[PDB]
Amino acid sequence: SKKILLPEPSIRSVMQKYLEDRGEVTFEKIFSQKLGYLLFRDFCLKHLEEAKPLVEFYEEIKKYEKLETEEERLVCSREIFDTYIMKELLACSHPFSKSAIEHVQGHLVKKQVPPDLFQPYIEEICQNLRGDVFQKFIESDKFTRFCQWKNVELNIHLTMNDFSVHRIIGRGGFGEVYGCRKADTGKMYAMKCLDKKRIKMKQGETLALNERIMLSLVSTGDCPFIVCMSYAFHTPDKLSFILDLMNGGDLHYHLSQHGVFSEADMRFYAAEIILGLEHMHNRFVVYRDLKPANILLDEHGHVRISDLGLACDFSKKKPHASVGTHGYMAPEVLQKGVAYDSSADWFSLGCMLFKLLRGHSPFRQHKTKDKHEIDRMTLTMAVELPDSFSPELRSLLEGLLQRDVNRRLGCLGRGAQEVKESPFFRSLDWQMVFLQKYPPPLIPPRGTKGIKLLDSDQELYRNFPLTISERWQQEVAETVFDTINAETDRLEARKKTKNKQLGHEEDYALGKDCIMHGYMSKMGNTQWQRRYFYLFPNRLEWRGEGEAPQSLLTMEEIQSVEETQIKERKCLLLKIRGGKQFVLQCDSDPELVQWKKELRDAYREAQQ
């Protein structure tokens, strides 16, 4: 039932080639993936000799980067020097280039402590690990394990069965949002449900789909300033966005509940919002709907940006459209034909910030539905501002709300950083907000239609299911990764004992110029018998567990390998030379695609 299960170590041969095909057996691709790294260091620290320091050194370097003030890092660098450079130089066990050493030297004697410092060393730890070291990881038991997880990573479809849904969190336009738990692990995520029916009604299919695309373009890398996507899946009628769990409402609500905000309080909000934008702009994405009600709060009082639906990718094609809520739009958006980038966000920002101090949108001097009056106030006027603000806040707002593209903050120069520097933000260390180490101003208190659905609409929702690799990994690693590794280490050492004194099956695949060996099911009228197959470049054998392979299906009698769908599963159809037909069922999607290819290659070359 509930708990997560690991597929056995024999999965190996199949996985290894699956990966290999996609060229994902590089040092790099594997160090980057959070479990890839974690398993690599576990192999280095326990089993290999010359690996030990290289890793402990790396891990210590990461901690240094992560430190905050000038004086914690000052100390940390010293120890590193002594321990991993100096003392290692005494017994010349230091394998690093001349130029490298001398960078760190010339710094530590001058007390200068940037977090980048240990970089040129970083790169050479990679270096030494990339070559030989990595190859022994390849053959290692820890690689075997890596496969095990990655398998399961790739085999992960979702239904509501995979969620224990708790409470309602407030509606969207196309349906509601809940809070829940993934019973896999037991993280707390939120669930945005869009009902397809509704999306067909409002012609928001363009939105619904775009919301998807954006969400995936953003969530890579870790952010705390964006509602972040961790999965995407659908049941016949419901869309599902597994999202970051965000509780105490939107800024809009709290603006109405608290009232206008003190200068210092806006600052905090501003900061975070800014950081958020930056992240988006770095993936070449423009939000466009920067507005009070799109900013959510967690229990602890910080914030994130939310509805990406109305956002865009400008990587190749810059937009000319008019998308946003009418109070907060830059001149560029509003105009018919003019192309813009991030710029429109920066304006939108100002407007929203303004609102947090004053109660209204900057151009909204009370016209309810008359959009054109908010639009012309934008174009002829950059609005005059009272004496209650500091001369410092005054120049931050006046520089943001320039009706020119060129003259405004966040445009012609460094972009996101231009804003970070204007004298309003003089009293902040910018990494401090990035850690969310500041205190928040507001800790939030203790909280239809009968139309049917085509097939033509349903095919707009394949190529939507998504599992953003990285996210999943994280989740695992905070909670179960560790005690599921040692539990299976227990199940695999018990599997080796039940076979020895009963005479182990002198493995007969590790002796021949074989090609692959994985688990499958086959048919004879309607049962499914589960068997273990062995693929040589001219035959395909099989044994039951206790015997030596009695049966074979040879390559030259195979006429066409195809895929079918037997009760909504994917399966393999093997046409034979008497007219005969034979069927294969796999467990894990990759497994399937690898048989599919390797059979199709072996029979093409066995018939040559």
CB contact at 8 A, 242 and 191: yes
Task: Quote the tokens at residue 21.
Answer: 């095909």
Our measurement of the distance from residue 296's CA atom to the centroid of its chain's CA atoms, rounded to an integer in Å, reads 20
Q: Residue 559 — φ and ψ, nearest 5°?
A: -110, -35
Total Cβ atoms within 10 A of residue 360: 12
- The domains of the chain are located at 8-50+131-157+468-508, 51-130, 158-247+449-467, 248-448, 509-608
DSSP 231-258: EEEEETTEEEEEEE---S-BHHHHHHHH
Element (H, E) at 18: helix 12-21
Residues 6+ apart with CB under 8 A from 427: none
Cα distances from 552 to residues 278, 542, 543, 600, in angstroms, run 60, 7, 9, 17
Q: Sign (positive/negative) of CA torsion 50, 56, 59, 61?
A: negative
Helix, coil or strand: residue 216: helix
Nearest Cα to Cα of residue 243 among 281, 272, 215, 206:
215
In degrees, rounded to 5, the angle at the alpha carbon of residue 350 between the alpha carbons of residues 289 and 221 is: 55
Task: Quote the tokens at residue 575.
Answer: 């046409």
Task: Quote the tokens at residue 346.
Answer: 């920066």
Name the burial class of residue 183, with classes exposed (0-12), middle (13-18) and buried (19+) by CB atoms within 10 angstroms of its CB. middle
Nearest Cα to Cα of residue 135 among 224, 48, 5:
48
Query: Rounded to whole angstroms, how far apart are CA atoms 9 and 101?
Result: 42
CATH topology of domain 248-448: Transferase(Phosphotransferase); domain 1 (1.10.510)
On whether 177 is known to bind a ligand per the annotation, the reply is yes
Residues 6+ apart with CB under 8 A from 92: none
Element (H, E) at 531: strand 527-536
Element (H, E) at 563: strand 558-564
Instruction: Identify the CATH number of the domain defined by range 51-130.
Output: 1.10.167.10
Q: Residue 193 — φ and ψ, nearest 5°?
A: -100, 125
389: left (phi over 0), alpha (psi -120 to 50) or beta: beta
Query: Rounded to whole angstroms, how far apart are CA atoms 28 and 314?
Result: 28
Task: Quote the tokens at residue 507.
Answer: 């493995």
Query: Rounded to whole angstroms, how far apart are CA atoms 138 and 144?
Result: 8
Total Cβ atoms within 10 A of residue 307: 19
On whether 524 is known to bind a ligand per the annotation, the reply is no
Q: Residue 299 — φ and ψ, nearest 5°?
A: -55, -35
CB contact at 8 A, 137 and 27: no
On whether 170 is known to bind a ligand per the annotation, the reply is yes
So which residues are the catalytic ones? Answer: 289
On whether 173 is known to bind a ligand per the annotation, the reply is yes
Architecture of domain 8-50+131-157+468-508: Orthogonal Bundle (1.10)
CB contact at 8 A, 208 and 174: yes
Element (H, E) at 394: helix 391-400
On whether 309 is known to bind a ligand per the annotation, the reply is no
CATH topology of domain 158-247+449-467: Phosphorylase Kinase; domain 1 (3.30.200)
Query: Rounded to whole angstroms, how far apart are CA atoms 507 and 145?
Result: 20
Query: Rounded to whole angstroms, how far apart are CA atoms 23 and 321?
Result: 40
CATH topology of domain 509-608: PH-domain like (2.30.29)
On whether 22 is known to bind a ligand per the annotation, the reply is no
Nearest Cα to Cα of residue 481 among 32, 164, 28, 42:
42
Q: Where are the alpha helices (DSSP H) in 312-363?
A: 331-334, 343-358
Helix, coil or strand: residue 539: strand
Resolution in A: 4.5
DSSP 48-96: -TTHHHHHHHHHHHHHHHT--SHHHHHHHHHHHIIIIIIHHHHTT----
